[PDB]
């Protein structure tokens, strides 16, 4: 099973490409029973190296594979509108990458196991903008959130909501210092105004 | 009855109309003080219109009753302070405006020579207080506007912020809480004018 050739039909899946020893090896294409079609490099019956897989619904990945999963630098385009360009780790967004959301949001930062995780900045379509840490695809740890007004909160976050100590600075110049828990003010706080009189 | 001048042993002088041996009618009296009164008299008392000029500088011009300021009258002070309003037997009482030399000027109610009731005070530092007063001090519900453009409205006690109140800024974002002796106390809530996501 050497040279070029065509083969398979596990279902109706036809692989056509290079071969070694009954394993697909080299560049080749494979239209799978789904209708998904991978066209790239192979290493011993798994996609390994660069390759493009078109999904039947519309999706389209472009990048490096390893052991039949996305691994390395790769671009995932949702022709609905989404677009991701960055590092992968065995099928999941992992490392650094940017994502353009359909709703208008844009992310730039770290990822771990297909989730925003680590440092990253997200420019919301509504005008807010977050610059801080993440955990499990939600704002977690210290961060800075600017609001389309121009005022901002800087403090701690937990599970996507304001939580812990924090300061909120106003355009006016005034400040409120207090503690949050699950996105809500409670406890003793301090509020400084810009002008005394 | 009639007119004539008199020199008391005190050094005081009176000349003007008399009735039954009592100063009554128009007359002028310069006191041993150096104070000189010039107005209407009734039975040896300032009563009706009159001016009283003090040797130190002050000058009352208005109506008198039972030898005391009573009715509408203007008093200008040592410092330059000018009161224009109603009097009640020597005390600011009713409605009156006081313009202090420091620049502040008050316009509101009075009771027993004290700011008491509703009144507006424009501070010289650019501020304005519109609220109630008790015993010459900001007391009750009031609105305090800062030159900032923000404003505090809530309650006052003995001249300081005290009780529930709201600071509302130029943005429309507001802080809601309670005060004790002009300083923040208790738990508060801060609301933003504009926020994320909604
Ligand atoms: Cl989040
Ligand atoms: Cl939140
Ligand atoms: Cl501003
Ligand atoms: Cl006061
Ligand atoms: Cl105060």
Numbering used by the authors:
A (entry chain B): 155 to 351
B (entry chain A): 156 to 353
From the paper:
High-resolution crystal structures and biophysical analyses of a truncated form of the TbMORN1 protein and its homologues from the parasites Toxoplasma gondii (TgMORN1) and Plasmodium falciparum (PfMORN1) enabled, for the first time, a structure-based definition of the MORN repeat. All three structures are antiparallel dimers joined via their C-termini, and, when possessed of the correct key residues, can adopt extended or V-shaped quaternary structures. The crystal structures confirmed that each 23-amino acid MORN repeat is composed of a β-hairpin followed by a 6-residue loop that connects to the next MORN repeat.
The structures of TgMORN1(7–15) and both P21 and C2 crystal forms of TbMORN1(7–15) were subsequently determined to 2.90, 2.35 and 2.53 Å resolution, respectively, with the PfMORN1(7–15) structure used as a search model for the molecular replacement. The two subunits in the TbMORN1(7–15) C2 crystal form and the TgMORN1(7–15) dimer make a rather straight assembly, while in the P21 form they display a bend of about 30°, leading to a rod-shaped particle appearance. The extended dimer interface is built from residues in MORN repeats 12–15, which connect the two subunits in an antiparallel, tail-to-tail orientation. A series of hydrophobic and aromatic π-stacking interactions between residues from repeats 14 and 15, together with hydrogen bonds across the edges, stabilise the dimer. ΔiG values lower than -10 to -15 kcal/mol and p-values lower than 0.5 are significant for stable protein dimers, indicating highly specific dimerisation interfaces. In the C2 crystal form, the dimer is additionally stabilised by two disulphide bridges formed between Cys351 at the C-terminus of repeat 15 and Cys282 from the β-hairpin loop of repeat 12.
